[PDB]
Design a protein around this ligand. Structure first.
Ligand SMILES: CCCCC/C=C/C/C=C/C/C=C\C/C=C\CCCC(=O)O[C@H](COC(=O)CCCCCCCCCCCCCCCCC)COP(=O)(O)O[C@@H]1[C@H](O)[C@H](O)[C@@H](O)[C@H](O)[C@H]1O
Ligand SMILES: CCCCCCCC/C=C/CCCCCCCC(=O)O[C@H](COC(=O)CCCCCCCCCCCCCCC)COP(=O)([O-])OCC[N+](C)(C)C
Ligand SMILES: CCCCCCCC/C=C/CCCCCCCC(=O)O[C@H](COC(=O)CCCCCCCCCCCCCCC)COP(=O)([O-])OCC[N+](C)(C)C
Ligand SMILES: CCCCCCCC/C=C\CCCCCCCC(=O)O[C@H](COC(=O)CCCCCCCCCCCCCCC)COP(=O)([O-])OCC[N+](C)(C)C
Ligand SMILES: CCCCCCCC/C=C\CCCCCCCC(=O)O[C@H](COC(=O)CCCCCCCCCCCCCCC)COP(=O)([O-])OCC[N+](C)(C)C
Ligand SMILES: CCCCCCCC/C=C\CCCCCCCC(=O)O[C@H](COC(=O)CCCCCCCCCCCCCCC)COP(=O)([O-])OCC[N+](C)(C)C
Ligand SMILES: CCCCCCCC/C=C\CCCCCCCC(=O)O[C@H](COC(=O)CCCCCCCCCCCCCCC)COP(=O)([O-])OCC[N+](C)(C)C
Ligand SMILES: CCCCCCCC/C=C\CCCCCCCC(=O)O[C@H](COC(=O)CCCCCCCCCCCCCCC)COP(=O)([O-])OCC[N+](C)(C)C
Ligand SMILES: CCCCCCCC/C=C\CCCCCCCC(=O)O[C@H](COC(=O)CCCCCCCCCCCCCCC)COP(=O)([O-])OCC[N+](C)(C)C
Ligand SMILES: CCCCCC(=O)OC[C@H](COP(=O)(O)OC[C@H](N)C(=O)O)OC(=O)CCCCC
Ligand SMILES: CCCCCC(=O)OC[C@H](COP(=O)(O)OC[C@H](N)C(=O)O)OC(=O)CCCCC
Ligand SMILES: CCCCCC(=O)OC[C@H](COP(=O)(O)OC[C@H](N)C(=O)O)OC(=O)CCCCC
Ligand SMILES: CCCCCC(=O)OC[C@H](COP(=O)(O)OC[C@H](N)C(=O)O)OC(=O)CCCCC
Ligand SMILES: CCCCCCCCCCCCCC
Ligand SMILES: CCCCCCCCCCCCCC
Ligand SMILES: CCCCCCCCCCCC
Ligand SMILES: [Ca+2]
Ligand SMILES: [Ca+2]
Lengths: 377, 377
């Protein structure tokens, strides 16, 4: 049990190894205690609070900001400790904020949630060819897969969900009347280039990042300025890379069904994005659209490394807190879509979702066979 | 530094020693995840959301409850580990909730805060002799002083602050026109009977608890039913008692100033209560008054034991998170009272507060002399 509680602190609160500059890792909470009071003193005595509309906004911004300060002192930093552990306590701080925001939304009705969205943005109330298709969103979609494949470390897992989702969005665009997106948009442009190009780049880096000899000289020791610039910049890159093996030839029925649940919660988070944008009508350029995608993308990096650790390591015996929070967020967003999306379906079929369930297991079982046989040949 | 980071986890997250019934200390976070998802599914698909006020109220309640659930998984449990550490993680979660609520209030104006209070309770908008004086509030004050003296473990500190605060409240009742509370009420009945009896009982229980031989037989091992009942009931009592010595004959200027700051913040936490209750006019029977007092009293129990540990232990090098949160709460309440209390003073004097500052140091210096000389005689 000494290992069973120590192995959780390698998942939940990964510690910094080989600290040389100790100014960056010594707490100053009393100075943080003195900063918050003087910060709020300036805002409680000099800010003009004569308008009620801008008082609620700045109060919300301050609650979010000062919850990030509390998260630095009290929240776990995941299995990541670069560039600083505190930047991952502040990402876990936003996960809890977004989790509790969804808990609130389940208890409202559609007229209150729509009135809430219009408060955030009043403009929401009133609302060759292939080359032009590539926009700033296609760049984000390419780098989303180049980051997912960086952590999943599998062609079979990433192409299984790249293909199934694009097939689903092609099918789910039967309801959407106005868009004229032809099938090649999400079967040739997306599956091949935006996804496969992203998947290829992400899996190419994993080979590089995991075969690299991680030798980290201290910043003070380097004498040449170009080395100091190299060392300063290299702080924002991983200090080590885990060797990921989702499947084993002797993998049990528990492990095989732990990668099956992994690729259902993965695809659940893609139905959340599709329906939240459709139930609450906002354009893809709105910060509610790509601001949420960036935040969920930031959460995913420590969640994939904590679900993998729990699933495989036999001395873990607890699932990391960030993976727990990414579990409620992904499940609650579906309940939000079912509750408020009671109207945009009349006779629509869940059978495709049921059919998607089988075609995922069909591809995990084929993945195990293609790797069990791989040892033989 | 191995001790400098280990000594913080004896303050922040005190671990349970000698666990025999392991059902009470084995996490089930995935079962917690399933419970939260099913509960929110039931409340999202079954609750009638046709009234907005009830929707907002139930959303607030659910957010508080699920923040408590998050705190059970991700927040430190103080130096206390009885009856369960989770019941102190939840207290810390409530502390953070209140801290952020205070952060929000600084950015509103008085009309918005009054509207919020009226939303919380619409009834707030429209709003021999000694034997009759003793009410449930007097009983609560007596038990609060008993609990305080249970942790401070000092007649000098407790009597100093009791006397100073009673004098301050007697003085501050110069502004209060309607109340006819004569000086005897808060110079004899309060100082002697309620406060004095509480202090006496607290110090008697300190003497009993710190001289007790803490031997904890496992619940399963006891065979007699009365012994099992005693062991079950005894779980809600401290498993050990720290020997508290605020002053030493060789105590430096740092320690003396630390006790001075301790008592200054202690009296600030009473100015906060007085001025909050007077600025936001609600009766002492309203839950906003005694609920807040109960919550601050619950916070105080680990805050005192963490401030003492930081102040005296020389290997601590960090102040516990509950102490940090109590500090921000105590300072932010004062800032709130200053911001919204800009009107109920015209020519009133801070000199008494300044005079109170000297008469506290006068009584710390006299406390050290009365104990430095104590060794000689
Ligand atoms: C509030 C709910 C929790 C209850 C709190 C008080 C009740 C006590 C009576 C006992 C009930 C039986 C259950 C007891 C829970 C076991 C004890 C307990 O606190 O575990 C919680 C999770 O909590 C559930 O996963 C609890 C899930 C169990 C309930 C599942 C069924 C629900 C329907 C975590 O513990 P732990 O020491 O690893 O806690 C962590 C701590 O959270 C981190 O801050 C530390 O960094 C880390 O090292 C470690 O100390
Ligand atoms: C409407 C729909 C219609 C059709 C629906 C039909 C649905 C069909 C139903 C599908 C469900 C199938 C479930 C099968 C589960 C088998 C058990 C299993 O493998 O357990 C474990 C893994 O599993 C876990 O327990 C992991 C934690 C899970 C909870 C956190 C979620 C966070 C998600 C984050 C996802 C991130 C995604 C990121 C994407 C980029 C392994 O077994 P174990 O022995 O416990 O493990 C041994 C190791 N220890 C314990 C010794 C350490
Ligand atoms: C308007 C008014 C008008 C007139 C105003 C005038 C005001 C006049 C101004 C008075 C202020 C005087 C302050 C002097 C402080 C000297 C330094 C000192 O003693 O430091 C330390 C203690 O002090 C700390 O640092 C403790 C942490 C403080 C922050 C947490 C707050 C939570 C409160 C919770 C209170 C709970 C209350 C509960 C009540 C029931 C000790 O020195 P050190 O060497 O750091 O310690 C050695 C130990 N280590 C470091 C090795 C471990
Ligand atoms: C004044 C700020 C001084 C400061 O931060 O010094 C600190 C030292 O100070 C101490 O060690 C004692 C604390 C002195 C009292 C200030 C507490 C906060 C009160 C606010 C009142 C608001 C002011 C305006 C309203 C009146 C700095 O040292 P530190 O390393 O950050 O301190 C310890 C940090 N760890 C080790 C615990 C992590
Ligand atoms: C954090 C780690 C990255 C997370 C994902 C990247 C953002 C993403 O995919 O959303 C992108 C945001 O685009 C950006 O702002 C990307 C920013 C630069 C790349 C990073 C767009 O992702 P999307 O909403 O799926 O784009 C499809 C939208 N159309 C074209 C279908 C209308
Ligand atoms: C929070 C948890 C959820 C995560 C994302 C969830 C998805 C939601 C994400 C983003 C959408 C948020 C709404 C923005 C669109 C509304 C219209 C608009 O332009 O508003 C703009 C918002 O401009 C701002 O100032 C926004 C500030 C940030 C918002 C919260 C994220 C915290 C990140 C902290 C990161 C810290 C570091 C982290 C670790 C490194 C400007 O407003 P405006 O149009 O001029 O009108 C303003 C006045 N009213 C009308 C609004 C009253
Ligand atoms: C169903 C609940 C089963 C349950 O809690 O069993 C668990 C075992 O289960 C596992 O080990 C695998 C997890 C199975 C998948 C459920 C994850 C949550 C999905 C929700 C979908 C919502 C359902 C309705 C909507 C579809 C119970 O065992 P546990 O000890 O609590 O689990 C490990 C706990 N630690 C060790 C990590 C602390
Ligand atoms: C939690 C640990 C106890 C915290 C303090 C006890 C409550 C307290 O003092 O407020 C008490 C609540 O009374 C209770 O509800 C006490 C509950 C039983 C005793 C515990 C009353 O404390 P107070 O507001 O200071 O009472 C003075 C009010 N008058 C008489 C001046 C009008
Ligand atoms: C939270 C952080 C701050 C702490 C305290 C700060 C001080 C504030 C404290 C208490 C004051 C709260 C307001 C209550 C008075 C208003 C009028 C009234 O009677 O309201 C009642 C409130 O009844 C409830 O249901 C209250 C639920 C609890 C509230 C939060 C505390 C969480 C404790 C969790 C402890 C868990 C375990 C902890 C560890 C073991 C009933 O309402 P009503 O009159 O019928 O009208 C209802 C409808 N409207 C009008 C309200 C819309
Ligand atoms: C702005 C600073 C640029 C970078 C300046 C710089 O020299 O960084 C070095 C520091 C610490 O580096 P060490 O070599 O002491 O620890 C190394 C440790 N064992 C490890 O490899 O993890 O990095 C940070 O904390 C960066 C905080 C970034 C804050 C955003
Ligand atoms: C400004 C921030 C820039 C991004 C900062 C950055 O690169 O660090 C993020 C982490 C760093 O990994 P560690 O060395 O802390 O953990 C090591 C552990 N054994 C492991 O498996 O990595 O890696 C990623 O998630 C890389 C994907 C990008 C995620 C956004
Ligand atoms: C309702 C249960 C009544 C009490 C039933 C009972 O038998 O309690 C024993 C348990 C654990 O007691 P142990 O002897 O295993 O540990 C002892 C440990 N080393 C120590 O001394 O701290 O206490 C709780 O967790 C109580 C949780 C209360 C949850 C509110
Ligand atoms: C339902 C809850 C009932 C109250 C539960 C209860 O009595 O436990 C609270 C703690 C228990 O102390 P521990 O044994 O965990 O810590 C031991 C550590 N070395 C120490 O110094 O105590 O003690 C107090 O604060 C007592 C004051 C009352 C506080 C309200
Ligand atoms: C881990 C990454 C977290 C980043 C949070 C994303 C929030 C972006 C908000 C953008 C709002 C822009 C308003 C004009
Ligand atoms: C550590 C103790 C925490 C207790 C929280 C106190 C909150 C009480 C609220 C009572 C409201 C009653 C409304 C009728
Ligand atoms: C009209 C389209 C606007 C898209 C803005 C994208 C901003 C990307 C910021 C990325 C930060 C990491
Ligand atoms: Ca697509
Ligand atoms: Ca009084």
């Amino acid at each position: 049990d000494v290992n069973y509680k120590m192995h959780f602190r390698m998942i939940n609160e990964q510690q910094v190894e080989d600290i040389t500059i100790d100014f960056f890792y010594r707490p100053h909470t009393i100075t943080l205690l003195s900063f918050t009071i003087v910060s709020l003193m300036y805002f409680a005595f000099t800010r003009d609070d004569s308008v009620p509309e801008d008082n609620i906004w700045r109060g919300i911004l301050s609650v979010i900001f000062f919850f990030l300060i509390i998260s630095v002192l009290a929240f776990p930093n995941g299995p990541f400790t670069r560039p600083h552990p505190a930047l991952w306590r502040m990402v876990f701080g936003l996960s809890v904020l977004y989790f509790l925001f969804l808990v609130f939304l389940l208890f409202l009705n559609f007229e209150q949630v729509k009135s809430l969205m219009y408060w955030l943005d009043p403009n929401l109330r009133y609302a060759e060819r292939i080359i032009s298709h590539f926009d700033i969103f296609a760049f984000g979609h390419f780098w989303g897969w180049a980051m997912k494949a960086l952590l999943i470390r599998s062609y079979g897992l990433c192409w299984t969900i790249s293909i199934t989702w694009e097939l689903t969005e092609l099918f789910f665009m039967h309801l959407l009347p106005n868009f004229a997106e032809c099938w090649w948009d999400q079967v040739i442009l997306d599956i091949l280039l935006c996804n496969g190009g992203g998947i290829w780049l992400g899996m190419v880096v994993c080979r590089f990042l995991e075969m690299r000899t991680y030798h980290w000289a201290s910043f003070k020791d380097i004498h040449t300025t170009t080395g100091k610039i190299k060392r300063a910049v290299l702080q924002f890159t991983p200090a080590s890379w885990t060797y990921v093996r989702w499947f084993d030839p002797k993998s049990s029925f528990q492990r095989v069904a732990g990668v099956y649940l992994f690729m259902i919660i993965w695809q659940l988070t893609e139905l959340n994005t599709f329906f939240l944008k459709h139930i609450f009508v906002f354009q893809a350029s709105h910060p509610l659209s790509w601001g949420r995608i960036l935040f969920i993308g930031g959460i995913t990096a420590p969640t994939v490394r904590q679900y993998y650790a729990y699933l495989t390591d036999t001395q873990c015996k607890r699932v990391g807190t960030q993976c727990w929070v990414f579990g409620v967020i992904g499940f609650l967003e579906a309940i939000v879509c079912i509750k408020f999306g009671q109207d945009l379906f009349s006779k629509t079929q869940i059978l495709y979702v049921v059919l998607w369930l089988l075609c995922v297991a069909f591809t995990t079982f084929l993945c195990l066979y293609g790797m069990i046989w791989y040892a033989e040949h």
